[PDB]
Amino acid sequence: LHKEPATLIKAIDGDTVKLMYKGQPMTFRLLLVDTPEFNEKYGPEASAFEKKMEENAKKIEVEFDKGQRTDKYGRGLAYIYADGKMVNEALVRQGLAKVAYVYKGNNTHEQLLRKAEAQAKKEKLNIWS
Ligand SMILES: Cc1cn([C@H]2C[C@H](OP(=O)(O)O)[C@@H](COP(=O)(O)O)O2)c(=O)[nH]c1=O
Ligand SMILES: [Ca+2]
C-alpha cells in the first residue's frame, strides 16, 4: 500500500470526510470502521474526534487498499492519515469506532485495527464503557 496526497475540504462525520484527491472533490468512507451516526450515542464525539484530527493536521494522506476504491455510493474507500497517524486506527483505539465492514481484498489493516479495538475494550473506553 502507498500513501497519496489529499487536502481536507470538510469534515463530515466520524467515518466520512470530503477531501480533494487528484484535484477533485470526493467523499471518503474510512475502511474497516463503523462510527455511531451523529444521531446516536458517541456519534457527536466520534465526529469531533475525526474533525479535530483532520483539521489540526498539516498533511492529510489517503491510502487505498488492494481492492475496490469506490463504494456503491461513489465514496472513495481508503485509510486516511493525519500527519502520518491513521484516523481509522485512532477512532478504534479510542473506542469511538468498531472494526466493521471487513470485506476480503480490502482488509490489509484488519489485524492492526482489531488490536486497537481489544485495547479500547480492555480500557472500557467510550463505546466499550
Ligand atoms: C466501509 C464500507 C461500506 N460500504 C457500504 C456498505 C453499507 O451499505 P448500506 O448503505 O447498504 O448499508 C454502507 C455503510 O456505510 P455507512 O456506515 O457510512 O452507512 O456502505 C461498502 O460497500 N464498502 C466498505 O468498505
Ligand atoms: Ca457509520
Side-chain angles (χ1 to χ4, degrees):
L1 308 195
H2 301 286
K3 295 167 208 283
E4 296 178 58
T7 52
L8 179 62
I9 296 162
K10 189 200 87 90
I12 302 171
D13 75 346
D15 66 22
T16 57
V17 50
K18 201 136 202 120
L19 307 172
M20 195 183 280
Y21 169 69
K22 289 184 161 186
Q24 306 306 145
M26 283 180 67
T27 291
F28 284 82
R29 181 58 168 82
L30 273 60
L31 282 171
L32 304 190
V33 303
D34 193 40
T35 58
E37 301 300 326
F38 186 93
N39 185 70
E40 293 162 1
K41 222 246 204 158
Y42 303 111
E45 291 75 9
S47 298
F49 185 88
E50 205 291 324
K51 173 172 169 174
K52 180 198 194 184
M53 190 165 178
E54 289 242 16
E55 283 183 353
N56 288 7
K58 271 45 275 226
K59 172 167 85 178
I60 299 306
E61 295 168 282
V62 315
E63 175 182 66
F64 291 104
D65 208 316
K66 298 269 174 152
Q68 277 157 38
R69 293 192 175 192
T70 54
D71 66 20
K72 65 193 191 177
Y73 300 112
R75 307 181 303 179
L77 299 169
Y79 309 102
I80 303 310
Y81 292 85
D83 284 335
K85 177 172 191 46
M86 208 204 301
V87 180
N88 318 51
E89 189 190 12
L91 281 159
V92 176
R93 174 67 186 86
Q94 291 304 304
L96 283 169
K98 297 190 204 207
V99 179
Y101 294 108
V102 183
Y103 299 92
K104 193 191 171 93
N106 269 346
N107 63 344
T108 299
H109 297 311
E110 182 183 8
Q111 293 309 136
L112 181 73
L113 299 196
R114 289 200 185 281
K115 177 54 172 290
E117 191 175 89
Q119 290 160 143
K121 197 176 318 203
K122 223 163 300 297
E123 296 167 11
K124 297 262 187 257
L125 286 176
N126 283 316
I127 288 183
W128 310 113
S129 69

